[PDB]
Symmetry: C3
Subunit: 184 residues, 3 copies
């Protein structure tokens, strides 16, 4: 499937926030021509962000997952998402060898330029809210930013944050859909 990059939809940890493989990021990018249709959720399985307790830890209120890409749209190893887990769809799994090119899935650099001395516009951000444990009283903000990281040609970053004082709440989320303008 040449039109979807994804993480497979299983629950196998693939992401490192605070410690190795502490999370499963489920991310599906579907190319609808000039726009990428994106669907995301997160399951934290272990470590610092698995169970939030803001009584115990009042300043644990946010964290970031970064996807960094080179000029060919290939995932770079400083990304929180592991390289072995990210590929074009084949059935419910991934192609068995790493892809060489995915520029058509990258966030457009004219729409979303890299940091510079020029005025920075907010249109490179999408805000949404997801819900921990599927409970409507457990919001957390998912802030997605395009092309704002260094050490790469392109980037997608997910910042998760919350303003409520959660007491023993597992960090596993509902799903959110957004889109962005494609590089080509």
């Amino acid at each position: 499937d040449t039109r979807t990059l994804w993480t497979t939809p299983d629950t196998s940890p693939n992401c490192t926030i605070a410690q190795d493989k502490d999370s499963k990021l489920t991310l599906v990018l579907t190319k609808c021509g000039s726009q990428i249709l994106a669907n995301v959720s997160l399951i934290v399985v272990a470590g610092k962000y698995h169970i939030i307790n803001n009584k115990t830890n009042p300043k644990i209120k946010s964290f970031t997952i970064k996807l960094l890409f080179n000029k060919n749209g290939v995932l770079l190893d400083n990304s929180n998402l592991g390289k072995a887990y990210w590929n074009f769809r084949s059935g419910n799994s991934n192609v068995s060898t790493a892809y060489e090119k995915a520029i058509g899935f990258m966030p457009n650099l004219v729409a979303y330029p890299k940091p510079s001395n020029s005025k920075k516009y907010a249109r490179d951000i999408v805000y949404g809210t997801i819900y921990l444990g599927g409970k409507p009283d457990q919001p957390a903000v998912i802030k997605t930013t395009f092309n704002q990281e260094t050490g790469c040609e392109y980037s997608i970053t997910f910042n998760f944050s919350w303003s409520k004082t959660y007491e023993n709440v597992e960090f596993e989320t509902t799903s959110f859909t957004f889109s962005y303008i494609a590089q080509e």
Copy 2:
């Protein structure tokens, strides 16, 4: 081939509390591995038509279920009626009831059926729509994939609200979401 829908008319096609009390307008468009979904609801009669939470404070939510078999065919005991749920042709439907739509079904690995395994929240999408198009009349639309029994796939819409509405007609703005496709 590419869009399954209810048609865009306002003819009731859904039974929440009594027969044909509502029009669910639902459009599913297959963009490969994801289904792009667009939904709204008009209740025209019955218990959920005109909401008054001063006289009936406990009337705060209701559910509309779409149940599908192994071939993605809508089951008769869904709240949505089978008659006008089909692949699009113009502003109407193809003239033959579809036999297969597995590519429009919610992915079972992403969204497993109920079991004794852990239930993860990623099979839910939350949104908010607005009654009467008024920005001070929110209601929550909670969409859940593959959590019904007696089917192979399902999409469930739970509508709820926390405001104390006084004689407010339950007809909504539109909401867009997506989900991971079975194949």
Copy 3:
């Protein structure tokens, strides 16, 4: 030449007139996924009345509207707030060289979203979202999008921006929002 996308281009060159000529860049991308249009929108105000919001100074400045009006062929009418010059089918990061003559497949569906009439008016022709000024999560503004409710046109898409906080010297430039709507054909 990308016939599946109508857009404004992704640059920041002003293309829109809210209160004075070319006071803003509306970035709007309509991508045809068959029976649905997948839409992505943001707004940058660069000058005039809506550039810098100060509701201490001007407590009544709380909202504005950007209208896109279309004829029977889906062509943008020149009384739209959006200018015709760079609304066109995509070619790379720019537009196709000549103005389009037909884009009916990008128009909002008139049965889903009928023009005003004696018949009951339903809310399903509206999409509500919230965007954030300056990308700050404590600076919400509501983006209300309405299909086919303007007169003097075959089809319309209108964006109403409003806020309910007392902003003091907040520049009106937004995060992005995605929605979809049912296409006419």
